Write a protein that binds this ligand. Structure first.
Ligand code: CLA
Ligand code: CLA
Ligand code: CLA
Ligand code: CLA
Ligand code: CLA
Ligand code: CLA
Ligand code: CLA
Ligand code: CLA
Ligand SMILES: CC(/C=C/C=C(C)/C=C/[C@@]12O[C@]1(C)C[C@@H](O)CC2(C)C)=C\C=C\C=C(C)\C=C\C=C(C)\C=C\[C@@]12O[C@]1(C)C[C@@H](O)CC2(C)C
Ligand SMILES: CC1=C(/C=C/C(C)=C/C=C/C(C)=C/C=C/C=C(C)/C=C/C=C(C)/C=C/C2=C(C)CCCC2(C)C)C(C)(C)CCC1
Ligand code: SF4
Ligand code: SF4
Lengths: 80, 192, 159, 205, 98, 41, 62
């Protein structure tokens, strides 16, 4: 049960959403950036914690943050 | 003024007695520190001024060297001989206790003062002749602080010359300088 | 003398060690022809050992109980050559290399592409900077007093 | 109007523009590059030139007159270890105090020009110099020379600085020659004169 | 040999006199400034330490100077200590010549 | 020839030349002044 | 915000270029943009980029 937060420094380049291997993130209409869109994390129950989204974020410091927490059979990535 | 042409520090305008702008280390930058330093300079200087006549007069009159004057203590017995006459109450413990109690009471009484000017210059019972009433306070204060600074330097010289020449007093060292000036000086200590 | 150490020339154990080394070398020498190259090399080693022991004895080194020289580094005037003089020489040389490196870095910093000069050294400029390092202490004190040696606005992290 | 340089075909550094006496554009190591240092180094060179001229006139002339035989002064490099009316340490301390006073006054002049021009005890004396390093006045300029038009003081100041530089080199040479060849400079000169091609620095070294 | 009763009496009397007359204003205003052990801006008893309620029945005074029995105990302890220090130093039998 | 000079100014080549010269100098000094433990001057 | 071509100092505390000078590239004049200024730097950060968006109150005129 990891937690993913998006901060208002996002520019809406959509790289984090493309990088997510489990479809946790998605783009949402917004006002506050030139692209006029921001990222959201509705399916945080499916997050595995790989932190590819953080690696894909261009910003001084990250606009998307992953805070590791309770481990579950989906978070542990178990096929058995 | 201590160094001709030198700029003067902002806090040391030049109004206090004996103020020559001498403060290379900047120790008087804090105002409360400056007031405390003024009072402490006055106390140290007054003590040195009252001390050094007692350093010189016994040696001139003999039976004293201001270092052998303390020699009777740290010796079993000898609790006597103020001025060539034994002291009936010369024992070390009673002397120490009396000095401690008396000086503690006097100094604590001094410490109970509110006005900084009265901290430095009490007046009243300490001026029986009323010298502080002749409209010459500035010049008298300047003379006091100048003689006091000279006395402080003189006592530091006494201490250092006692360190350099154990068993000797100030007048003996002066007579040594006068005996052969060009081969009896501080060079024999600075340059072995 | 100092810390109960005897001089090397006066000490016994220094001479014993010299005798032992010479004896070992001659024992090795006993196996070769007198005029062959190994004999000449061994003789050269023997003479070098003799010269080294003579120089150590005559230079004024203290000697321990085991027969080996010891060094004094507390500032004694009789043993300045042990530590203080080589220390000053090293300080001069190291300050020279460091100062010229810093000067070259500063001069390269304002360039079209500083990193290219950072990997590919500008040899003429480097030689000029290197030659100007003879008087590094004077320039170092000059920039220390002029306020052009240290920086005040540098990058730091979240305190 | 391009003055001669220490190295023909070169160009003088920017900070050495040619106004100072003895300016040959010689500063390969940029020791006076920063604006502040030039005045300090000028004062240092002046004081060094004058001290070295005094040292040269006190080393070479006594040795020459001793070699001739008019005087009988001892050798310069061993004259310190002699017997005087005062102890050596006492003389050292006395000179430290007197030179402390003189050098403190010179320092006060250097830091604040024109601030110590007057006698501290009798305020009616008032040294009459204008250029730092050239105090002037009755004490230091009695005959009144060296007080003239600009570009006229240039010549005499250049003469002084060049004789001083020559004296500095001569004194350093005397020091090292005494250290290496344990004889006075005049005998070394005679040795180089008699056998020039064998009595040289190379020696048997 | 030093008289124990005389030495202890004199030392304790001197310390009690000092405490009552000489250093009493300094002690009073310094303890007034360093008021009470305080945690988070509130005293321990008011913070909720029932065992830390100050005892005032043991602090009642009738001296014009407000001199307290705990003050008596402190200065008398110092007096007994100094008296025994002097007694032991006198009877030590150790007289170094300096 | 300009390209050759630029290549010879690269960090590894210059380091090799400099350290070779320094090592040669130290080796020759120790050949002519061996077994030097304390500085005579 | 600062005009194009200005030299500004970053004041964002978590920025990689804190207390470092930048080069203003473009300023967005839309009313609702939260970080409209674009600043380009000389050295790259750990992620390897050299451009960032800053608010007008996180930059210094020098
Ligand atoms: C800072 C002040 C000060 C202090 C602490 C002392 C302390 C001392 N003085 Mg002294 N003295 C002082 C000022 C001071 N003096 C001044 C201002 C004078 C000039 C009048 C003298 C003139 C003087 C003489 C002439 C002698 C001393 C002696 C002594 C010593 C014996 C003390 C004694 O039994 O007297 C307490 C006696 C009665 C209360 C003692 C170390 C004596 C000494 O050291 O002889 C060995 C001694 O002969 N003093
Ligand atoms: C207050 C001013 C003052 C005066 C008038 C004197 C006067 C004297 N000092 Mg003296 N001295 C002073 C301050 C003073 N001192 C201070 C502040 C110090 C501490 C640094 C010393 C440390 C000192 C030493 C170490 C020596 C003297 C000595 C002397 C005597 C010879 C002069 C000399 O060598 O210098 C002379 C009686 C010398 C002396 O008496 O030897 C015969 C000597 O060896 N003084
Ligand atoms: C904290 C350690 C320390 C430091 C910094 C120095 C520093 C110095 N020593 Mg030194 N020294 C030390 C400990 C130290 N000493 C100890 C423990 C000894 C043994 C007693 C000595 C014995 C010593 C001698 C014998 C001499 C020095 C000298 C010197 C000076 C050269 C220099 C200031 C020299 C000096 O000051 O000459 C006057 C000198 O001759 N030192
Ligand atoms: C005091 C500093 C100083 C130094 C280090 C030098 C150093 C040098 N000068 Mg020089 N020079 C100086 C002062 C100095 N000069 C002064 C004051 C003058 C008078 C204007 C000259 C006039 C002078 C001439 C005319 C020439 C040199 C030349 C030279 C070079 C070769 C000299 C030689 O014998 O070989 C050498 C780099 C010669 C040289 O190699 O020029 C390229 C040369 O032709 N110098
Ligand atoms: C830097 C300047 C300087 C210095 C430090 C000295 C220092 C000295 N000179 Mg000297 N001298 C100088 C310049 C100088 N001289 C000049 C410019 C002349 C000319 C002389 C002519 C001279 C003579 C004729 C004698 C000295 C002597 C001496 C010695 C004792 C003097 C006393 O007093 C002393 C080592 C005397 C001495 O002992 O001979 C070395 C001596 O007889 N000097
Ligand atoms: C050859 C050496 C030499 C030369 C040419 C000069 C030249 C000069 N000096 Mg100088 N001086 C010298 C050596 C020299 N000095 C030495 C060794 C000292 C140390 C004592 C001084 C100390 C000195 C002082 C303190 C002052 C000067 C001043 C002057 C100027 C006055 C002109 C003069 O006196 O006639 C020059 C002709 C000779 C000196 C013939 C020498 C016989 C002039 C620039 C004054 C100045 O700068 O302007 C007012 C000044 O105040 N001189
Ligand atoms: C500038 C003035 C000057 C003058 C006129 C002389 C003149 C002389 N020197 Mg001398 N010397 C000088 C400066 C001077 N030197 C300096 C600055 C140093 C180094 C600090 C030396 C170091 C030196 C040594 C070590 C020796 C001489 C020797 C000699 C004599 C033989 C010539 C020789 O070997 O030259 C060699 C001169 C140099 C290497 C110095 C360079 C000359 C400068 C650049 C001018 C001769 C009388 C020799 C001697 O006494 O023979 C009897 C000797 O052994 N000199
Ligand atoms: C902190 C490390 C350290 C230090 C201080 C030293 C210090 C020393 N070593 Mg040593 N050494 C070390 C590490 C170290 N070594 C290591 C790690 C090894 C193994 C690779 C060696 C292997 C080694 C050998 C094989 C020899 C030394 C030698 C020496 C002496 C230098 C000879 C000399 O003066 O050259 C003179 C050189 C200069 C003065 C340089 C001048 C530079 C410029 C031109 C001056 C301007 C000196 C006592 C030699 C010696 O004699 O030992 C007694 C020697 O034969 N060392
Ligand atoms: C040589 C010297 C200085 C030389 C400096 C040089 C070359 C600098 C060159 C450069 O910096 C430049 C210009 C520009 C830079 O870009 C490049 C370099 C190349 C770095 C000073 C000598 C200075 C020499 C001095 C000060 C001599 C003083 C002598 C005195 C006082 C003598 C006293 C006595 O001899 C008597 C009279 C008789 C007895 O009593 C005994 C005693 C006591 C020994
Ligand atoms: C009332 C009154 C009065 C009186 C008073 C009195 C009388 C008091 C007293 C008091 C006192 C009298 C007190 C005391 C105290 C004491 C103490 C408190 C002590 C203590 C001690 C100790 C603590 C000890 C310790 C020790 C030991 C044990 C061992 C050894 C060591 C020692 C010493 C450390 C009068 C008249 C004035 C008037 C007014 C009122
Ligand atoms: S950590 Fe991995 S799974 Fe979780 S949101 Fe980021 S990219 Fe998706
Ligand atoms: S990668 Fe970063 S800036 Fe880009 S859309 Fe995702 S959170 Fe926003």
């Amino acid at each position: 049960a990891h937690s993913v937060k998006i901060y208002d420094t996002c520019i809406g380049c959509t790289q984090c959403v493309r990088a997510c291997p489990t479809d946790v993130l998605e783009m949402v209409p917004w006002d506050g950036c030139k692209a006029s869109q921001i990222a959201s994390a509705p399916r945080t129950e499916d997050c595995v914690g790989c932190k590819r989204c953080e690696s894909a974020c261009p910003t001084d410091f990250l606009s998307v943050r992953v805070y590791l927490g309770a481990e579950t059979t989906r978070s542990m990535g178990l096929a058995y | 003024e201590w160094l001709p042409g030198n700029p003067r520090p902002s806090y040391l305008d030049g109004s206090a007695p004996g103020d020559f702008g001498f403060d290379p280390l900047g120790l008087g930058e804090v105002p409360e520190n400056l007031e405390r330093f003024k009072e402490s300079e006055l106390i140290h200087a007054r003590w040195a001024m009252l001390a050094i006549p007692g350093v010189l007069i016994p040696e001139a009159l003999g039976y004293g060297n201001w270092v052998s004057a303390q020699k009777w203590a740290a010796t079993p017995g000898g609790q006597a001989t103020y001025l060539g006459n034994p002291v009936p109450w010369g024992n070390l413990p009673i002397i120490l206790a009396v000095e401690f109690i008396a000086i503690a009471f006097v100094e604590s009484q001094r410490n109970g003062e509110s006005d900084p000017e009265k901290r430095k210059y009490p007046g009243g019972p300490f001026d029986p002749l009323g010298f502080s009433k002749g409209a010459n306070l500035e010049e008298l204060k300047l003379k006091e602080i100048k003689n006091g600074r000279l006395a402080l330097v003189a006592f530091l010289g006494f201490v250092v010359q006692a360190v350099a020449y154990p068993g000797t007093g100030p007048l003996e060292n002066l007579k040594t300088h006068l005996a052969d000036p060009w081969h009896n000086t501080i060079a024999h200590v600075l340059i072995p | 003398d100092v810390a109960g150490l005897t001089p090397c020339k006066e000490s016994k154990g220094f001479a014993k060690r010299e005798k032992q080394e010479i004896k070992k070398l001659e024992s090795r020498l006993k196996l070769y022809a007198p005029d062959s190259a190994p004999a000449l090399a061994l003789n050269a080693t023997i003479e070098k050992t003799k010269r080294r022991f003579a120089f150590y004895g005559n230079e004024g080194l203290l000697c321990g109980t085991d027969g080996l020289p010891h060094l004094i580094v507390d500032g004694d005037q009789a043993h300045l050559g042990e530590f203080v003089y080589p220390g000053l020489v090293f300080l001069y040389i190291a300050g020279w290399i460091g100062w010229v490196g810093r000067a070259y870095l500063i001069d390269v910093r304002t360039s079209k592409k500083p990193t290219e000069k950072e990997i590919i050294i500008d040899v003429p400029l480097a030689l000029r900077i290197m030659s100007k390092g003879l008087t590094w202490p004077v320039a170092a004190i000059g920039e220390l007093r002029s306020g052009k040696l240290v920086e005040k606005s540098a990058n730091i992290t979240v305190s | 109007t391009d003055r001669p340089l220490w190295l023909p075909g070169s160009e003088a550094p920017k900070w050495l523009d040619g106004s100072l006496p003895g300016d040959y554009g010689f500063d390969p190591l940029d020791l006076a590059a920063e604006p502040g240092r030039l005045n300090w180094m000028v004062q240092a060179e002046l004081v060094h030139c004058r001290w070295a001229m005094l040292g040269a006139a006190g080393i070479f002339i006594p040795e020459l007159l001793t070699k001739i035989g008019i005087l009988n002064t001892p050798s310069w490099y061993k004259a310190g270890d002699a017997t005087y009316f005062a102890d050596q340490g006492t003389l050292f301390i006395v000179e430290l105090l007197l030179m402390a006073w003189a050098e403190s006054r010179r320092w006060a002049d250097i830091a604040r020009p024109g601030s110590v021009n007057t006698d501290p005890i009798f305020p009616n004396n008032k040294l009459t110099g204008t250029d730092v390093g050239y105090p002037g006045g009755l004490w230091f300029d009695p005959l009144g020379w060296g007080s003239g038009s600009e570009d006229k003081l240039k010549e005499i100041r250049t003469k002084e600085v060049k004789n001083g530089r020559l004296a500095m080199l001569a004194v350093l040479g005397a020091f090292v020659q005494a250290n290496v060849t344990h004889v006075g400079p005049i005998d070394n000169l005679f040795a180089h004169l008699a056998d020039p091609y064998h009595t040289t620095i190379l020696q048997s070294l | 040999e030093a008289n124990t009763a005389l030495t202890i009496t004199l030392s304790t009397g001197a310390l009690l006199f000092l405490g009552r007359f000489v250093f009493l204003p300094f002690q009073r205003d310094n303890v007034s400034r360093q008021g009470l052990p305080v945690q988070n801006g509130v005293t321990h008893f008011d913070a909720g330490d029932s065992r830390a309620q100050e005892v005032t029945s043991f602090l009642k005074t009738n001296d014009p100077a407000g001199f307290t029995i705990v003050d008596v105990l402190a200065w008398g302890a110092l007096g007994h200590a100094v008296g025994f220090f002097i007694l032991a130093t006198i009877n030590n039998g150790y007289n170094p010549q300096f | 020839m300009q390209d050759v000079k630029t290549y010879l100014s690269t960090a590894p080549v210059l380091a090799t030349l400099w350290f070779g010269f320094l090592a040669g100098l130290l080796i020759e000094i120790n050949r002519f002044f061996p077994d030097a433990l304390v500085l005579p001057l | 915000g600062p005009k194009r071509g200005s030299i500004v100092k970053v004041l964002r505390r978590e920025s990689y270029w804190f207390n470092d000078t930048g080069k203003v590239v473009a300023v967005d004049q839309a009313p609702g943009v939260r970080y409209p200024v674009v600043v380009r730097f000389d050295k790259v950060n750990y992620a390897g980029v050299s451009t960032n968006n800053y608010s007008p109150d996180e930059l210094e005129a020098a």
